[PDB]
């Protein structure tokens, strides 16, 4: 797998800093590229955590799995600890498209079973049902990384 | 510091940004460039109160906390109509329909 | 700066920076082929929805490429479906 | 309290197992040092009736709970069997416990010579 943690033995202290209004789910990509859910971060909180250089992390809304950014990007990799200092992983909301933001709100208000009882254009039902998922986003990111290489 | 504004007259709304340190007159100059009416032919309001030309936007009450891009502050605009300033009039936007039952 | 006029189904006129309106591919397509030069009319987008769309163009322009904590774009339950319909049409 | 020669042997064997590094330089004992908490992984405590880790083993040498090399062997064999019970065959951790079990046997032979 292209997106996976490197089996490194280099310890790396990180500050997971939740600068978003959501409950954050940190996701560690294991050595076999499989996503591993870690303890959640309430909004406006930070935790000093133990990781390794070369380890791959993703951040999602814990409740919905909506995508979040870390240091203005999708993946976080602990790197060089300058003069002992822990690495800061600033977790924030992306500037979502209006469509994706609307989908989020409609999803929070309607049960999936009731999506097709809404009076909207047919393709919007498909978008409502295309729930945000770690595995889905990984597949897209894998293609994105392969195209660069 | 940037302030995000809705300048409203009747059925017209101008969406614009400005500096907190910028003045009412500079904002009247932005209105002139768009609606082709000189500053003296305009009256600007923050709710019921008429804003003075010299006063900064921050002095009027427009701060980053209240004039947000996703929630702009309303600046009322009145023009001199039939040789005299018309009463301040802003037409309301439409009303959202009854919320769907599956959304209830 | 250039300005464009976006007109709601109920005749409300929203004057926004050309740059903000070009966020939408649909708006771009209707500013390059249809009454005036930089005026676009939306026959099915009401003023309570169009106003929120203009707020969204502002929010997007301000918060894209910025080192600041990004606030949530708020959307009231009552405008949620109609805002979804327009955002879909507009591709925003 | 145990005789001083016995305590030295126990620590020498356990240090060999813990400081064991494979071909890649990876310390196989690393994940086995500390058990997962009962809060984070309650299934582990529902499945494994006698949980042990290398910190618990070190503490049992130190407090003279093991009165022989056989007593120490039983706990290392229990840690490895636990690892082999909870985790799937072929997983890194399952495989690491197989190697640690072998390293223990060799280290006990060396000290007995
Ligand atoms: C607080 C907070 N808020 C937001 S994020 C957060 C937070 C942040 C950090 C931590 C701790 N840090 C890590 O988990 C880091 C992160 C990422 O970089 C990978 N990682 C590791 O440490 C990995 N290790 C290594 O790469 C190396 F050490 C070899 C170099 C490892 C997962 C494979 C262990 C945290 O940890 C809490 C949850 C993390 N889990 C890590 C694995 C743990 C574990 C520990 C001991 C185990 C074990 C599993 N398993 C299995 C394997 C998985 C299923 C259970 C197992 N089976 C056994 O049978 C056994 C026995 Br016999 C004896 C002793 C331990 C044993 N263990 C359980 C907790 C919470």
Short mmCIF file of N, CA and C in Angstrom, two decimals, chain A residues 19-22 72 93-99 101-103 105-106 109 118-121 124 127, chain C residues 53 56 59-60 63-67 69-73 75 77 80-81 83-85 87-88 92:
data_model
loop_
_atom_site.label_atom_id
_atom_site.label_comp_id
_atom_site.label_asym_id
_atom_site.label_seq_id
_atom_site.Cartn_x
_atom_site.Cartn_y
_atom_site.Cartn_z
N UNK A 19 -8.42 22.80 16.63
CA UNK A 19 -8.77 24.20 16.34
C UNK A 19 -9.98 24.22 15.41
N UNK A 20 -10.94 23.35 15.68
CA UNK A 20 -12.16 23.18 14.93
C UNK A 20 -13.36 23.09 15.91
N UNK A 21 -14.61 23.36 15.46
CA UNK A 21 -15.75 23.25 16.38
C UNK A 21 -16.30 21.82 16.52
N UNK A 22 -15.62 20.85 15.94
CA UNK A 22 -16.03 19.44 15.92
C UNK A 22 -15.25 18.59 16.91
N UNK A 72 -3.05 22.52 7.31
CA UNK A 72 -3.62 22.94 6.03
C UNK A 72 -3.56 21.84 4.95
N UNK A 93 -11.05 22.96 10.30
CA UNK A 93 -12.10 22.69 9.33
C UNK A 93 -11.58 23.08 7.97
N UNK A 94 -11.86 22.32 6.91
CA UNK A 94 -11.53 22.85 5.57
C UNK A 94 -12.55 23.92 5.19
N UNK A 95 -12.28 24.68 4.12
CA UNK A 95 -13.28 25.59 3.56
C UNK A 95 -14.06 24.61 2.69
N UNK A 96 -15.16 24.07 3.19
CA UNK A 96 -15.95 23.12 2.42
C UNK A 96 -16.66 23.84 1.28
N UNK A 97 -17.02 23.11 0.20
CA UNK A 97 -17.84 23.69 -0.88
C UNK A 97 -19.23 23.87 -0.26
N UNK A 98 -20.01 24.83 -0.76
CA UNK A 98 -21.38 25.07 -0.27
C UNK A 98 -22.19 23.79 -0.38
N UNK A 99 -22.07 23.07 -1.52
CA UNK A 99 -22.77 21.79 -1.68
C UNK A 99 -22.42 20.80 -0.60
N UNK A 101 -21.11 21.43 2.39
CA UNK A 101 -21.61 21.95 3.65
C UNK A 101 -23.12 21.73 3.81
N UNK A 102 -23.92 21.95 2.73
CA UNK A 102 -25.37 21.75 2.74
C UNK A 102 -25.73 20.31 2.97
N UNK A 103 -24.96 19.39 2.34
CA UNK A 103 -25.16 17.94 2.46
C UNK A 103 -25.01 17.51 3.91
N UNK A 105 -25.45 19.37 6.73
CA UNK A 105 -26.58 19.90 7.48
C UNK A 105 -27.84 19.06 7.20
N UNK A 106 -28.09 18.74 5.93
CA UNK A 106 -29.29 17.95 5.60
C UNK A 106 -29.17 16.56 6.24
N UNK A 109 -30.05 16.41 9.91
CA UNK A 109 -31.47 16.65 10.17
C UNK A 109 -32.44 15.56 9.69
N UNK A 118 -37.47 13.58 0.50
CA UNK A 118 -37.19 15.01 0.27
C UNK A 118 -37.53 15.35 -1.17
N UNK A 119 -38.03 16.57 -1.44
CA UNK A 119 -38.39 17.01 -2.80
C UNK A 119 -37.20 17.74 -3.44
N UNK A 120 -36.22 16.96 -3.93
CA UNK A 120 -34.98 17.46 -4.54
C UNK A 120 -34.67 16.69 -5.83
N UNK A 121 -33.74 17.22 -6.67
CA UNK A 121 -33.31 16.58 -7.92
C UNK A 121 -32.67 15.20 -7.60
N UNK A 124 -29.03 14.45 -6.14
CA UNK A 124 -28.82 14.89 -4.77
C UNK A 124 -29.10 13.75 -3.77
N UNK A 127 -25.81 11.88 -3.71
CA UNK A 127 -24.85 12.66 -2.92
C UNK A 127 -25.13 12.56 -1.41
N UNK C 53 -25.99 32.48 -0.41
CA UNK C 53 -25.04 32.10 -1.46
C UNK C 53 -23.95 33.19 -1.55
N UNK C 56 -21.71 32.95 1.43
CA UNK C 56 -20.81 31.85 1.12
C UNK C 56 -19.65 32.28 0.17
N UNK C 59 -17.30 34.22 2.45
CA UNK C 59 -16.68 33.30 3.40
C UNK C 59 -15.56 32.50 2.71
N UNK C 60 -15.84 31.95 1.51
CA UNK C 60 -14.89 31.15 0.76
C UNK C 60 -13.64 31.96 0.35
N UNK C 63 -11.60 32.88 3.65
CA UNK C 63 -10.94 31.79 4.37
C UNK C 63 -10.09 30.84 3.53
N UNK C 64 -10.18 30.86 2.19
CA UNK C 64 -9.31 30.04 1.33
C UNK C 64 -7.89 30.61 1.43
N UNK C 65 -6.87 29.73 1.55
CA UNK C 65 -5.44 30.08 1.69
C UNK C 65 -5.20 31.08 2.84
N UNK C 66 -5.60 30.68 4.06
CA UNK C 66 -5.46 31.53 5.24
C UNK C 66 -5.04 30.75 6.48
N UNK C 67 -4.04 31.28 7.21
CA UNK C 67 -3.52 30.70 8.46
C UNK C 67 -4.31 31.34 9.62
N UNK C 69 -8.02 30.09 12.33
CA UNK C 69 -9.01 29.08 12.67
C UNK C 69 -10.25 29.43 11.84
N UNK C 70 -10.69 28.48 11.03
CA UNK C 70 -11.82 28.63 10.13
C UNK C 70 -13.12 28.34 10.88
N UNK C 71 -14.06 29.32 10.91
CA UNK C 71 -15.35 29.07 11.58
C UNK C 71 -16.26 28.20 10.71
N UNK C 72 -17.26 27.57 11.31
CA UNK C 72 -18.25 26.78 10.59
C UNK C 72 -19.12 27.73 9.72
N UNK C 73 -19.49 27.29 8.49
CA UNK C 73 -20.40 28.12 7.68
C UNK C 73 -21.80 27.74 8.21
N UNK C 75 -25.83 27.28 8.62
CA UNK C 75 -26.98 27.06 7.73
C UNK C 75 -28.13 26.62 8.61
N UNK C 77 -31.73 25.12 9.76
CA UNK C 77 -32.52 24.00 9.19
C UNK C 77 -33.53 24.39 8.10
N UNK C 80 -31.98 24.95 4.62
CA UNK C 80 -31.09 23.83 4.28
C UNK C 80 -31.35 23.13 2.94
N UNK C 81 -32.62 22.77 2.64
CA UNK C 81 -32.96 22.08 1.40
C UNK C 81 -32.81 22.97 0.18
N UNK C 83 -31.09 25.66 0.00
CA UNK C 83 -29.70 26.07 -0.16
C UNK C 83 -28.92 24.94 -0.84
N UNK C 84 -29.35 23.69 -0.59
CA UNK C 84 -28.74 22.51 -1.22
C UNK C 84 -29.04 22.45 -2.72
N UNK C 85 -30.29 22.78 -3.08
CA UNK C 85 -30.78 22.84 -4.45
C UNK C 85 -30.02 23.89 -5.27
N UNK C 87 -27.01 25.42 -4.39
CA UNK C 87 -25.58 25.09 -4.38
C UNK C 87 -25.30 24.00 -5.42
N UNK C 88 -26.26 23.07 -5.61
CA UNK C 88 -26.15 22.04 -6.61
C UNK C 88 -26.18 22.65 -8.00
N UNK C 92 -21.40 25.06 -6.26
CA UNK C 92 -20.65 25.72 -5.20
C UNK C 92 -20.62 24.94 -3.92
#
